Design a protein around this ligand. Structure first.
Ligand SMILES: *[C@@](O)(CSCc1ccccc1)[C@H](CC(=O)O)NC(=O)[C@@H](NC(=O)Cc1cc(Br)ccc1OC)C(C)C
Ligand SMILES: *[C@@](O)(CSCc1ccccc1)[C@H](CC(=O)O)NC(=O)[C@@H](NC(=O)Cc1cc(Br)ccc1OC)C(C)C
Lengths: 91, 140, 91, 140
């Protein structure tokens, strides 16, 4: 007999209420940094631990660029939401 | 144990729903490059034993079916369920190729008692879209 | 120049939309299991990793009990939300 | 590095705001046992070098001040900020001893550009309260 909302996990590209940035060329900030980590790390680390550098690698090395006073110079931060009940290691 | 069980004859089923071309009536801008993503993810989860199935430009009343279809499936022998989404959106919402839909009545079909086979198995929902309309100026 | 919503972390006692259970005697499910983990583990594990058994230790060994058809036999699941950009080890 | 910086001359400042006796007018039930918690947490974070300060039955227009007071403080030499909350509530909301308050305009005072000293430092907000009114039946 266990909770039904558990074992879930939501790793959002951005935090609540904000805009999510995607590149007209390469692809979503969050989405690339993601695969990019799951590439080097999906066999060394955990998952949440993996999800944190994703965030790191998007808060640190990314930034918006535009002609619109309004959209120029903006950042992003993903959001890791977990209802999981155990760690996860892909293997 | 502390770590999840990941060694069933199948590792998973990774469903990436790439949405990009929005019906004009919805007045929804296009998503230049989702494909790069969808293509990258498609490869990233293919490299770890996942039956990835990329579906594109589906409608809200298309995405749900898909789901209701996926949750009604024998996953008895599978170690997880990754469900990448790609589209636009407002908080909690999620866009189909005609109009909004609610993130929650999506995830529901997997909720403990709903999707049984997937009980005590990680349901990972990666979502790549807008969660409202604020701007992050940053500091330091 | 970094995101302002990052380095945050919200570990909720329950998931969104639900009720949170607390004991008229011992204290909040989530709150005890918490200290209880930070007790044995705050010097062995990480933090998120620590937050997961909290969830585990509440989804597994806890359950509501009442005379009200309506509140009897209910569960809980905490919610770990992280905008942090690095792991955390208390020491 | 991958791990956060945790070795400043001070480890932290753990603010536990225990709320329990709600003004009758608000028609808010009491919280039988928060004290056990508040007492347990108070000890749990005292055991790891945190200046814990337990404040009780504060009002929404009391909690904010507290905050605005805490965020306006030299934390230049401190490794983190834990802010346990204990009360009742609705989603996003949080109760004072007179009426609701919003979780967000609380956390704001620490937001990158607001609370500077606390930039690149973990702001942990543990919250123990209701997030709405659904019931979890469970399964298996
Ligand atoms: C959001 O969903 C757009 S806002 C969604 C919305 C729904 C209902 C009502 C109102 C608004 C998407 C998410 C996604 O990527 O699918 N985000 C964007 O479209 C994003 N634009 C860009 O990333 C493009 C971009 C890139 C740079 Br660098 C500089 C400027 C710029 O803006 C055109 C946001 C920022 C609009
Ligand atoms: C919730 O905040 C109560 S609902 C908050 C609300 C705000 C605005 C409008 C409407 C409702 C609290 C959270 C907290 O612990 O502070 N949750 C409860 O009071 C909780 N009750 C109990 O845990 C007590 C209990 C324990 C057992 Br075992 C069996 C039954 C029972 O219920 C009295 C919920 C479940 C009401």
């Amino acid at each position: 007999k266990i909770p039904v909302e558990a074992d879930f996990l939501y790793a959002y590209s951005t935090a609540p209420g904000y805009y999510s940035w995607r590149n007209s060329k390469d692809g979503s900030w969050f989405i690339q940094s993601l695969c990019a980590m799951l590439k080097q790390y999906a066999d060394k680390l955990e998952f949440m631990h993996i999800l944190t550098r994703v965030n790191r690698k998007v808060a640190t090395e990314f930034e918006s660029f535009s002609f619109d006073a309004t959209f120029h110079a903006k950042k992003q931060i993903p959001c890791i939401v977990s209802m999981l009940t155990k760690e996860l290691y892909f293997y | 144990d502390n770590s999840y069980k990941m060694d069933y004859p199948e590792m998973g089923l990774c469903i990436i729903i790439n949405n990009k071309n929005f019906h004009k009536s919805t007045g929804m801008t296009s998503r230049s490059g989702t494909d790069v993503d969808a293509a990258n993810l498609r490869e990233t989860f293919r490299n770890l034993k996942y039956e990835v199935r990329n579906k594109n430009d589906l409608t809200r009343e298309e995405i749900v079916e898909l789901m209701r279809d996926v949750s009604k499936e024998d996953h008895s022998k599978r170690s997880s369920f990754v469900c990448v989404l790609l589209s636009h959106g407002e908080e909690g919402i999620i866009f189909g190729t005609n109009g909004p839909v609610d993130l929650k009545k999506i995830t529901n079909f997997f909720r403990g008692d709903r999707c049984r086979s997937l009980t005590g198995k990680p349901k990972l929902f990666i979502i790549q879209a807008c969660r409202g309309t604020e701007l992050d100026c940053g500091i330091e």
